[PDB]
Amino acid sequence: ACVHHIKRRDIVLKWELGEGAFGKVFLAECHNLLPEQDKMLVAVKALKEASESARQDFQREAELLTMLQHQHIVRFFGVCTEGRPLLMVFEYMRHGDLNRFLRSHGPDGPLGLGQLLAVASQVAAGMVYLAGLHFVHRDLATRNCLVGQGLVVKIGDFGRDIYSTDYYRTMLPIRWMPPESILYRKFTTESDVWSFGVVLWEIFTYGKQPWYQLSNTEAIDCITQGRELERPRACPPEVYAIMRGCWQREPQQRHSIKDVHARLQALAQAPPVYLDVLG
Numbered sequence: 001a002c003v004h005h006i007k008r009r010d011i012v013l014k015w016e017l018g019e020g021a022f023g024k025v026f027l028a029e030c031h032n033l034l035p036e037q038d039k040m041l042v043a044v045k046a047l048k049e050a051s052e053s054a055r056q057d058f059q060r061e062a063e064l065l066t067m068l069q070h071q072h073i074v075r076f077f078g079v080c081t082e083g084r085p086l087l088m089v090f091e092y093m094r095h096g097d098l099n100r101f102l103r104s105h106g107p108d109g110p111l112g113l114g115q116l117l118a119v120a121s122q123v124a125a126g127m128v129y130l131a132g133l134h135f136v137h138r139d140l141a142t143r144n145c146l147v148g149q150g151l152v153v154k155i156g157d158f159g160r161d162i163y164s165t166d167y168y169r170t171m172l173p174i175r176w177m178p179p180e181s182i183l184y185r186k187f188t189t190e191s192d193v194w195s196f197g198v199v200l201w202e203i204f205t206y207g208k209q210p211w212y213q214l215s216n217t218e219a220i221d222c223i224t225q226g227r228e229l230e231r232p233r234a235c236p237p238e239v240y241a242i243m244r245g246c247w248q249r250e251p252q253q254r255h256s257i258k259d260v261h262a263r264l265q266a267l268a269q270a271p272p273v274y275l276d277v278l279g
């Protein structure tokens with residue numbers, strides 16, 4: 001609702017974390033932001049376009065970001081609209097995006113079953129919060145989740161460049177989409193549940209691409225024909241049953257995210273005795 005304004009001179013740019021067609025993402029130090037922290041690390045999203053239409057969409061986005069307040073949603077600290085580029089200030093998530101984190105802590109040391117369940121439960125918690133507000137993400141994927149201090153996982157959205165392999169042309173993240181979104185461009189709480197099922201599969205494959213053996217066109221055929229991603233080796237049968245509940249063809253037959261979260265949280269507190277090496 002009421003967007004916080006940060007003075008330009010309170011932001012000290014330290015490094016470039018990434019860039020897209022929108023502009024750049026920087027690592028920065030922000031002064032006079034949090035109490036007892038005279039200097040603190042932040043991630044700064046800088047918009048290249050300064051047009052009156054870009055400014056209005058930026059204001060809309062900033063207001064929405066101000067409203068979202070949750071333990072597993074990336075924190076937004078405010079804006080800097082002191083001329084071009086328009087800046088958005090977020091907490092800095094020191095371990096980067098979940099997709100890269102899963103691949104860097106994969107068998108290629110490796111995250112254990114308990115750690116994989118805690119990651120999945122935390123992504124589910126953030127989605128319970130979004131579903132409660134009737135907020136539809138539309139791009140739920142591990143590339144849009146972030147890992148901070150102490151394996152804390154939060155949902156975000158990079159809006160960047162390194163993941164254009166994940167979108168097919170308007171750019172659509174087709175491998176994470178249910179049949180009703182591919183065919184009709186219909187995005188709901190139910191399509192977010194399907195994308196969560198795919199997020200679960202990415203977690204338990206340590207960040208592999210869904211349908212990696214196939215081109216975008218072939219993956220659309222698999223999805224729209226009712227083909228299902230196979231059970232990952234690190235995935236216990238109890239977690240795969242949760243993924244399958246997310247992937248019902250009909251949106252009305254998929255489980256609610258609150259129920260998916262409650263099942264995952266119960267397994268994260270008491271992990272099933274499952275050894276990936278024994279299958």
Ligand SMILES: CNC(=O)c1cnc(N)c(O[C@H]2CN(C(=O)Cc3ccc(OC(F)(F)F)cc3)CC2(F)F)c1
Pocket residue numbers: 017018025043044045065068073074075076090091092093094095096097130137146155156157158159
């Ligand atoms: C190497 N480390 C990095 O790259 C890195 C580290 N820490 C970051 N904070 C970061 O920021 C990038 C990711 N961002 C968002 O996730 C923003 C966001 C968007 C929607 C939302 O609400 C939700 F409900 F939709 F999820 C909540 C937050 C902004 C960004 F681009 F700056 C990058």
Ligand SMILES: O=c1[nH]cnc2scc(-c3ccccc3)c12
Pocket residue numbers: 013014015016017026
């Ligand atoms: O981000 C980088 N990558 C590779 N070389 C360099 S030299 C300087 C930077 C930098 C420093 C501050 C803000 C933005 C960028 C940089």
